[PDB]
């Protein structure tokens, strides 16, 4: 199983449909990796919308925008999984489960690119 875009999507779709609240920590760790990899499939310009969608999904206040956006930004810019590993280490299991559940609920339905020019062109191709 090679980690193509489609395999990534199929993996995300599978786990999005799981209730991971009782998942083994080892699998949860891998899901954080999945979320990080998937985050990096979004243009940087889309991270604000990703954050906003997360807040709405989870009924979180706007005062939570800063920390949530920061997580997405630092996953997006992560090198060698450094931030990802720090996040895993620092956060409690429950927080990680909730974040990953939320991400998998929103990531598949959110556009990965926002650029109007780009969106226009691609629309004429979609079958």
């Amino acid at each position: 199983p090679k980690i193509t875009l489609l395999t990534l999507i199929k993996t995300a779709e599978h786990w999005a449909r799981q209730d991971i609240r009782t998942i083994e920590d080892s699998k949860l760790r891998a899901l954080l990796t999945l979320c990080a990899v998937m985050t990096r499939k979004f243009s940087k310009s889309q991270l604000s919308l990703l954050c906003e969608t997360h807040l709405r999904r989870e009924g979180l206040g706007q005062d939570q925008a800063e920390p949530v956006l920061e997580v997405y930004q630092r996953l997006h810019s992560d090198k060698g999984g450094s931030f990802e590993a720090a996040l895993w280490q620092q956060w409690d299991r429950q927080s990680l489960i909730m974040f990953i559940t939320a991400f998998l609920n929103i990531a598949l339905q959110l556009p990965c690119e926002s650029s109007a020019v780009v969106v226009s062109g691609l629309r004429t191709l979609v079958p």
């Binding site: 807040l55 009924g59 206040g61 939570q64 800063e66 630092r74 931030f83 996040l87 620092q90 909730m98």
Partner: peptide
């Protein structure tokens, strides 16, 4: 060095 941000706080029910 930049500390890991805290997880979001959920509203109390």
């Amino acid at each position: 060095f930049v500390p890991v941000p805290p997880p979001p706080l959920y509203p109390p029910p």
